[PDB]
Paper text:
κB-Ras1 and κB-Ras2 are small GTPases with noncanonical features that act as tumor suppressors downstream of Ras. Via interaction with the RalGAP (GTPase-activating protein) complex, they limit activity of Ral GTPases and restrict anchorage-independent proliferation. Other noncanonical GTPases of the Ras family are κB-Ras1 and κB-Ras2, which were originally identified as regulators of NF-κB signaling. In contrast to most GTPases, they lack a membrane targeting motif and a catalytic glutamine. κB-Ras GTPases not only show intrinsic GTP hydrolysis but also have fast nucleotide exchange rates, which shifts them into a constantly active form at physiological G-nucleotide concentrations.
We identified a fragment of RGα2 (RGα2N, residues 2–255) that forms a stable complex with κB-Ras1 (1–175) when coexpressed in bacterial cells. This RalGAP subcomplex was crystallizable, and we determined its structure at 2.72 Å resolution. κB-Ras1 adopts a canonical G domain fold comprised of a six-stranded central β-sheet and five α-helices. The N-terminal domain of RGα2 is composed of 10 helices forming tandem repeats that are twisted and have large loop insertions with short β-strand and α-helical elements. The nucleotide-binding pocket of κB-Ras1 is occupied by a magnesium ion and the nonhydrolyzable GTP analog 5′-guanylyl imidodiphosphate (GNP). Second, κB-Ras1 contains a leucine at position 65 instead of the catalytic glutamine 61, which is found at the equivalent position in Ras GTPases. Leu65 is tightly bound in a hydrophobic pocket formed by Cys10 of the β1-strand, Leu71 of switch II, and Leu100 of the α2-helix. The Gly64 carbonyl is oriented in a way that together with the backbone carbonyl of switch I Thr38, a water molecule could be coordinated in a position suitable for nucleophilic attack on the γ-phosphate of GTP. We observe no interactions of the κB-Ras1 switch region residues with RGα2N, consistent with previous findings that κB-Ras binding to RGα is nucleotide independent. The binding interface is constituted of helices α4 and α6 of RGα2N 10-helix bundle and the strands β1 and β2 of κB-Ras1 at the back side facing away from the nucleotide-binding pocket. Finally, a large loop inserted between α8 and α9 of RGα2 (V157–F211) folds back into a binding groove between α1 and β2 of κB-Ras1.
Numbering used by the authors:
A (entry chain C): 5 to 108, 112 to 168
B (entry chain A): 7 to 177, 184 to 199, 207 to 254
The structure:
C-alpha cells in the first residue's frame, strides 16, 4: 500500500515517520530538508492483521512549490500534515485535500503536529476539528515528542488499506 | 522512431503498471546513449526511482514465495543494473540524501551476511558507488558499514559503542521493516579485502564521471575511510 506524506516545510513529516518507526527523533538537533524517500513499515490493523505500507516522504511544500502531480496518480493513501503553530501549514492541508479529490477510493489521515507549543498555537482546535468533520476525514492533533500520539492515526490508515 | 517514442511514453505514464513501466525503462537503458540517458534521468528522477523501488520490493516478496529460480535471478540482475544507473546518473541528488533511507535499506539487503557470496559482493560494489556520491554528506552509519565490509578485522568503535556489520544491519504493535537476506546462501579476510580493493580500483578507473567530476572528491573521501580503517592493518 503506497502512502504519500505531504505538507509544508518543517511541519514534522519526517520526524513523525522516524519517531514512529524508531522513536529516536531528538527535537531540533539534526535538521536536513527532505527531498524524496521511502520508509517501509508494517502496521497492525484493528483486526490484528499486519499491512505493509510504503511510506513515501515528500519534499516540503512551499509558495510556488507544489506537490508533483504523479503522486496523485499512484498514491493509495495520504498523510496530510500541518503544524498547529503555523496557520499556513493548515491552509495548505486544505488545498491539497481539494486536489486529492479532483485527481481521482483513498485513505487520508490529517495530523496536527507540534501541540507541545500550545501557547504558540495558530490553528484553533475547534476550527481544525470542524474542517475535519466537513471534509469527512479523520484528524488527530499529535506531537513528535510523545510517540503515543502518533500510533492512533497510523493504525486507522492501515485498517482502511 | 516508434520504439523509443512508444517506450518512453509508457515509462512516463503513471497509470501503467510499474512492472510494465520497468520493462520499457530497461529497454531505454539498452538502446539510448549515455548522455541522452543522463538527461532523461535528471528530468525524471522521481518516477524512475519509483519504478525501481516498487519493482525491487516486488521481487523481494517473490523470492520469499517462489524461492530462488533462474528466472528470478534474471529479474534481480536487471533491477540492480537499473539501480547502478541510478547511482551513476544522479550523484548530486544522492549526495543530498535523495532516497537516503530506501537506498540504504536496499543495500543492506544485499550486504547481509546470510546472502550468497555473489550477492554480498554485489552489495559491496553498489555501496561504494553510493558512498562515493554521498561523500562527506554521509551519516556516521555509512562509515561504520565501510569499516565492517570485511569480516575479521578488529571490532569497529562507534559513538554508542562497539559494532559489527551484522549489528548495523539488524539491531510492540508498529515496527519498521526488518532487513532479511535477498538470496540466502545454501550450504575469509583474504577474500573480502580483495573485493574491496578490486572495486575501489575500478571506481578510480571508472569513466563517464559527471561533468562536475565530484567523483574525484568522493573517491578521495572513500580513500580516507580506507586509509583510516583498513590500511593500518595492511603490511
Ligand atoms: N517541539 C517539537 N518539535 C517538533 C515536532 N515535530 C517536529 N519538530 C521539529 O521540527 C523540525 C522539522 O522536522 P522535520 O521532520 O525535518 O520536518 P519536514 O517537514 O520533514 N522538513 P521538509 O518539509 O523541509 O522536508 C525539527 O527540528 C523537529 O525536531 C514536535 O512535535 N514538537
Ligand atoms: Mg521531510
Amino acid at each position: 500500500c503506497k502512502v504519500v506524506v505531504c505538507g509544508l516545510l518543517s511541519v514534522g513529516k519526517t520526524a513523525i515517520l522516524e519517531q514512529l518507526l524508531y522513536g529516536n527523533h531528538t527535537i531540533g538537533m539534526e535538521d536536513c530538508e527532505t527531498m524524496e524517500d521511502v520508509y517501509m513499515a508494517s502496521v497492525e490493523t484493528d483486526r490484528g492483521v499486519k499491512e505493509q505500507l510504503h511510506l513515501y516522504d515528500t519534499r516540503g511544500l512551499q509558495e510556488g512549490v507544489e506537490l508533483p502531480k504523479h503522486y496523485f496518480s499512484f498514491a493509495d493513501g495520504f498523510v496530510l500534515v500541518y503544524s498547529v503553530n503555523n496557520l499556513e501549514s493548515f491552509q495548505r492541508v486544505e488545498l491539497l485535500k481539494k486536489e486529492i479529490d479532483k485527481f481521482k477510493e483513498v485513505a487520508i489521515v490529517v495530523l496536527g503536529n507540534k501541540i507541545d507549543l500550545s501557547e504558540q498555537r495558530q490553528v484553533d482546535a475547534e476550527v481544525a476539528q470542524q474542517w475535519a468533520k466537513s471534509e469527512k476525514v479523520r484528524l488527530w492533533e499529535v506531537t513528535v515528542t510523545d510517540r503515543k500520539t502518533l500510533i492512533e492515526p497510523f493504525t486507522l490508515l492501515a485498517s482502511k488499506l | 522512431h516508434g520504439d523509443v517514442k512508444k517506450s518512453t511514453q509508457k515509462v512516463l505514464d503513471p497509470k501503467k503498471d510499474v512492472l510494465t513501466r520497468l520493462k520499457h525503462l530497461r529497454a531505454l537503458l539498452d538502446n539510448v546513449d549515455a548522455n541522452d540517458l543522463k538527461q532523461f534521468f535528471e528530468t525524471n528522477y522521481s518516477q524512475i526511482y519509483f519504478i525501481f523501488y516498487e519493482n525491487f520490493i516486488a521481487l523481494e516478496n517473490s523470492l520469499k514465495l517462489k524461492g530462488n529460480n533462474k528466472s528470478q535471478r534474471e529479474e534481480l540482475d536487471s533491477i540492480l543494473f537499473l539501480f547502478e544507473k541510478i547511482l551513476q546518473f544522479l550523484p548530486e541528488r544522492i549526495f543530498f540524501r535523495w532516497h537516503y533511507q530506501s537506498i540504504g535499506s536496499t543495500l543492506k539487503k544485499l550486504l547481509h551476511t546470510g546472502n550468497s557470496i555473489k550477492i554480498r559482493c554485489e552489495g559491496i560494489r553498489l555501496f561504494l558507488l553510493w558512498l562515493q556520491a554521498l561523500q562527506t554528506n554521509c551519516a556516521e552509519e555509512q562509515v561504520l558499514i565501510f569499516a565492517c565490509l570485511v569480516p575479521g578485522f578488529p571490532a569497529v568503535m562507534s559513538s554508542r559503542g562497539p559494532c559489527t556489520l551484522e549489528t548495523l544491519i539488524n539491531p510492540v504493535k508498529i515496527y519498521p521493516e526488518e532487513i532479511t537476506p535477498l538470496l540466502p546462501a545454501i550450504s575469509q579476510t583474504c577474500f573480502f579485502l580483495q573485493i574491496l580493493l578490486k572495486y575501489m580500483v575500478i571506481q578510480a578507473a571508472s569513466l563517464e564521471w559527471k561533468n562536475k567530476e565530484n567523483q574525484d572528491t568522493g573517491f578521495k573521501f572513500l580513500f580516507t575511510l580506507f586509509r583510516k580503517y583498513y590500511l593500518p592493518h595492511l603490511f
